[PDB]
Design a protein around this nucleic acid. Structure first.
Ligand SMILES: [Mg+2]
Lengths: 24, 155, 98, 127, 78, 60, 120
RNA sequence: CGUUAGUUGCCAGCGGUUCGGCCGGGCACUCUAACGGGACUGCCCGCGAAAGCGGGAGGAAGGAGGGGACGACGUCUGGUCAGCAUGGCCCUUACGGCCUGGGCGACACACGUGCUACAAUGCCCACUACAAAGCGAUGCCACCCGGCAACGGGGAGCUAAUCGCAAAAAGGUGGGCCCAGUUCGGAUUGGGGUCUGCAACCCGACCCCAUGAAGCCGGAAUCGCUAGUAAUCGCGGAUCAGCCAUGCCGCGG
């Protein structure tokens, strides 16, 4: 989970955004 | 617990069968503080004791529990020269806990792939009196009794 | 229709110094919609107590801006008198609006 | 026509108006079972009624905001109860034995410096 | 990693360009190890400082987009 | 080098990246709060005196 | 069936099962299963031969793959030796390549452990 | 719980509502924040010489109601001359200064503190207001367009209970994976790009394509916590161009 930048969690945790977690 | 003898933290009754002893059980099932999922599981498990047996879940639950309570156990004891497993009776609060602890544990050791089934089978198989819970019950009772010789210290 | 802001560090002397403006706008003005207190803007600092490695044991400091608001619906020069000058604030700020 | 209580529970506030008759319960502009959906414990929030026998012969309109779904659940529970003492003096002499009337004092205790987490201290290795 | 120029140093091209109006030098020393190696300005062996001295790095075509210090390593027995 | 340094940190420099804060009191590179120009040390100091307006000891 | 190189997935979803190729990730698999219009939830076990080829062709032609790649990367790193840049030795010296500590960790690029003695 | 106070609350009550508490209308409620009230073993039973101890009533709160700030004479010839201050001693075309580059990031190894996992009480994807501290005018960036995205355009609003960071996440509901080193886990490496900065080789973080390692719950040992605690899930801030923060100080579920 929290370590895959290509999960959604991966990005919540990292704080970042992108393909796998977009800005609404 | 040096000063006082500690109040037995009381429990809200169940919002279904209305029993403290149920929530007690539910609590043990709960993992990371997720009481919701915990509850779903125990109820969904009572459903697999309709679909499987004509009996009322509660009665099975009660009667399985009653089957996994130990009567004796070896409390450890140091004396200056060797270690002594000394058999004493079991106070009813401890019975309560060991049983309910054991059930969940026995249950999560089972093979079936889903929470509510493992709970269910165990619950059934132990009210018949052949649980893997009931194993680690007759073992304790047996472990006392085999150390029946040292049963004359009991402090 | 007057809208005057009051910011502060000292809670007790906004409610003091700017409740002269609920008198000198009632005696020579008329209608008053009382003081309204706006939530505070607290600025916390946290310092390691010693000059050296003692990364636990710290002290806590907060400098808090108390915000206060005043509305009065009779804009006369009957009022812009004690409300032109007649003072008791000393570390306050004020925004004058309409 | 109308009755009131203000339930609160750990950052959660419960505006509660009951009305006589029906049984339906609007909560933040939603049916009870749409707001508390799947949440197995909510049925408790309306336990104060089952206490007095007003089972489901009140309606109730409820705003509830602040923090938490289950904290809200208990918050309401205080309203639903604080509302009916204020529509019957004698609604008291059997809600105290069950104490739906106590606020519930408990709250996220504070993070202390040096600990990880309020009480949980870090990990001593000693050698 | 950039894309608006190649952030390579003034003092270096001045010296490269105006060296290539007929110039064939190795004695060419520099401390600008953060300047990108520029399209085909090859041949010339640059001397790069690693913090202690200047390294004789003879340059080839295949090592272009790389920055200059990738060839002047900064530490010993690694 | 702490002297030639305190001075050079007042200058304007070739490239603004080389700037930085520095406890104006206790001439200090590290932990200098932006709203003060003040090393956490030369600070807990003034704070205690009252020479710092509206700054109180926090407690909750 | 045989998609790439000398490759054969099976008996699972095609999205997943496409994965079993060197160069096909979870992303390139979505992309392929719509730019040739094959529902992803089908098991390989049962899908058209019309479709095994409309897949085959898309995949081998959109991109470099399955050991064409294994050789390309192979060929890249052997170039990073070049005259010899930094990342070169580093690969030569089997150490982390992307600027990270070696005092501790660096296990994934080092042989289990290689313990010695010390400290007096 | 009361008092005071209306650019945050509201059909609570009625009117208009392009159905956005937005438009009049109102602080009742919620809240924001300033002052007050409340708990004292005061009341009843029982024991006791007393202090008080065991129970019970009332009450939001009982017997220190829950958390802070607060650290006695002194002990460790404890820590720090590198924050500062300071006696003493040593350097004074150099043990001072200024710069370019390098190093503080080295790696056969070994401990500490953590993070992330080893899965089905789980992972993935879709939808779905439960909100409870803070930061913002050489900035927060709503909204548009371009881009799979990082980000780049244009551009509004708010010196900010008004505007923005801001989506809380666990949860709920649907669907999917079927016990597989896997749709578990995301180390390593390849490639292509974004941003900040004079400059990102040594030495930044971010996005995307590929690559997918060890890990199937851990020997002898050993750590934390007694209640909103532990366990679990996100949120913000300080320093700061950016950032190696999984750290730290805080907030709630
Ligand atoms: Mg260091």
């Amino acid at each position: 989970g929290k370590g895959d930048r290509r999960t959604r969690r991966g990005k919540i945790w990292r704080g970042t955004y992108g393909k796998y977690r977009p800005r609404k | 617990a040096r000063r006082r003898r500690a109040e037995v933290r009381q429990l809200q009754p169940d919002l279904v069968y209305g029993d403290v002893l149920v929530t007690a059980f539910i609590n043990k099932i709960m993992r990371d503080g997720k009481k919701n999922l915990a509850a779903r599981i125990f109820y969904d498990a009572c459903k697999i004791i309709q679909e499987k047996t004509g009996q009322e879940p509660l009665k099975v639950f009660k009667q399985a529990v009653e089957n996994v309570k130990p009567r004796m156990e070896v409390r450890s004891r140091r004396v200056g020269g060797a270690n002594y497993q000394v058999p004493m009776e079991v106070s009813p609060r401890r019975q309560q806990s060991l049983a309910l602890r054991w059930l969940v544990q026995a249950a999560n050791q089972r093979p079936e792939r889903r929470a509510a089934v493992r709970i269910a089978h165990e619950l059934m198989d132990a009210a018949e009196g052949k649980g893997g819970a009931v194993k680690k019950k007759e073992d304790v009772e047996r472990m006392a009794e085999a150390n029946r010789a040292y049963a004359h210290y009991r402090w | 229709k007057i809208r005057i802001k009051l910011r502060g560090f000292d809670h007790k002397t906004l409610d003091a110094s700017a409740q002269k403006i609920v008198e000198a706008a009632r005696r020579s003005g008329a209608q008053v919609s009382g003081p309204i207190p706006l939530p505070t803007r607290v600025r916390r600092f946290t310092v390691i107590r010693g000059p050296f490695k003692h990364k636990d044991s710290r002290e806590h400091f907060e400098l808090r801006t108390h915000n206060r608001l005043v509305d009065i619906i009779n804009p006369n020069r009957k009022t812009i008198e004690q409300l032109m000058t007649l003072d008791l604030p000393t570390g306050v700020e004020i925004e004058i609006k309409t | 026509e109308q009755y009131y209580g203000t339930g609160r529970r750990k950052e959660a506030v419960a505006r509660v108006f009951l009305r006589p008759g029906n049984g339906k319960v609007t909560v933040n502009g939603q049916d009870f079972n749409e707001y508390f959906q799947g949440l197995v414990r909510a049925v408790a929030a309306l336990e104060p009624l089952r206490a007095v026998d007003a089972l489901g012969r009140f309606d109730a309109y409820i705003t509830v905001r602040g923090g938490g779904k289950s904290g809200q659940i208990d918050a309401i529970k205080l309203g639903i109860a604080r509302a009916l003492v204020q529509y019957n003096p004698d609604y008291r002499a059997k809600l105290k034995p069950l104490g739906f009337l106590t606020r519930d004092a408990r709250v996220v205790e504070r993070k202390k410096y040096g600990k990880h987490k309020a009480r949980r201290a870090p990990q001593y290795s000693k050698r | 990693s950039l894309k608006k120029g190649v952030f390579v140093d003034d003092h270096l091209l001045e010296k490269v360009l105006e060296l290539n109006a007929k110039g064939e030098k190795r004695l060419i020393k520099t401390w600008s190890r953060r300047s990108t190696i520029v399209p085909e300005m090859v041949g010339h062996t640059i001397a790069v400082y690693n913090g202690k001295q200047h390294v004789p790095v003879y340059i080839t075509e295949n090592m272009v987009g790389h920055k200059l210090g990738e060839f002047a390593p900064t530490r010993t027995y690694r | 080098a702490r002297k030639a340094l305190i001075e050079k940190a007042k200058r304007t420099p070739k490239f603004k990246v080389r700037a930085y804060t520095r406890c104006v009191r206790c001439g200090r590179a590290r932990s200098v709060y932006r709203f003060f120009g003040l090393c956490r040390i030369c600070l807990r100091e003034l704070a205690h005196k009252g020479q710092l307006p509206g700054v109180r000891k926090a407690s909750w | 069936a045989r998609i790439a190189g000398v490759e054969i997935p099976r008996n699972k979803r095609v999205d997943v099962a496409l994965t079993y190729i060197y160069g096909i990730g979870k992303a390139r698999a979505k992309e392929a299963l719509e730019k040739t219009g094959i529902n992803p939830a089908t098991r390989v076990k049962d899908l058209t031969e019309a479709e095994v080829v409309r897949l085959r062709e898309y995949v081998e032609n959109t991109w470099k793959l399955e050991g064409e790649l294994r050789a390309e990367v192979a060929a890249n790193i052997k170039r990073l030796m070049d005259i010899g840049c930094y990342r070169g030795l580093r690969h030569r010296r089997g150490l982390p390549v992307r600027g990270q500590r070696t005092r501790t960790n660096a296990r994934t690029r080092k042989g289990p452990r290689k313990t010695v003695a010390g400290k007096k």
